[PDB]
Amino acid sequence: MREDKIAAKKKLHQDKRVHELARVKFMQDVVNSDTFKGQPIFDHAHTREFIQSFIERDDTELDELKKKRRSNRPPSNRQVLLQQRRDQELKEFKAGFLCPDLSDAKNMEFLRNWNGTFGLLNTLRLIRINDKGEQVVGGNE
Numbered sequence: 001m002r003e004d005k006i007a008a009k010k011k012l013h014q015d016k017r018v019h020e021l022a023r024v025k026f027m028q029d030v031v032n033s034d035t036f037k038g039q040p041i042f043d044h045a046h047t048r049e050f051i052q053s054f055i056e057r058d059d060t061e062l063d064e065l066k067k068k069r070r071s072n073r074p075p076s077n078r079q080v081l082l083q084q085r086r087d088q089e090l091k092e093f094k095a096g097f098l099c100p101d102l103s104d105a106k107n108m109e110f111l112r113n114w115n116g117t118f119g120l121l122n123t124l125r126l127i128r129i130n131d132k133g134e135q136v137v138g139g140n141e
Contacts, residue, residue, distance in 0.1 A: 016118055016121070019089075020121060022054075023051075023098075023099075024100070024111060024121065024124070025114065025116075026050065027050060027102070027111055028112055030050070031111070031112055032112060040105065041102070041103055041105055041108055042103065042108075043102065043133070044102065044103070044133020044134075045132065045133060046102060047101075047129055048131065048132050048133055050102075051093065051097055051099055051129070052093075055086065055089045055093060056086070058082060058083075061082065062083060062086075065078070093130070093131075094130065094131070095130075095136075096128030096129060096130050096136030097128065097130070098128060098129075099126065099128075099129040100125055100126055100127075101127055106125070107125035110124055110125075111124060
């Protein structure tokens with residue numbers, strides 16, 4: 001009903017979304033933890049493995065909606081909407097998802113040293129990867 005005398009002051013720099021950062025954070029954390037600490041470098045098969053898990057994580061969340069369906073209260077709109085975002089995310093992946101090559105040890109070490117740095121997201125060996133680790137190029141040959 002009421003607003004304060006102060007208006008919502010704004011930021012000058014545009015923020016990057018977690019769709020980019022959390023993706024690297026996952027890869028980083030996996031390497032930095034005993035999860036795959038024994039594995040120094042990965043490949044493009046592990047690319048799809050981790051990339052798809054990052055996207056399809058929505059289904060793990062959607063599963064809770066599928067769960068509360070038995071509570072006799074399913075989210076008619078939001079359960080569909082959640083799945084619709086998956087279609088969009090998969091479509092971006094299908095158009096070459098912004099993924100590290102994951103096989104370059106220089107890139108992987110920078111990936112390890114990601115201190116939540118935005119500029120580091122430009123120094124990383126990030127390319128566009130489709131499906132099974134396919135190289136997405138605009139057309140240079």
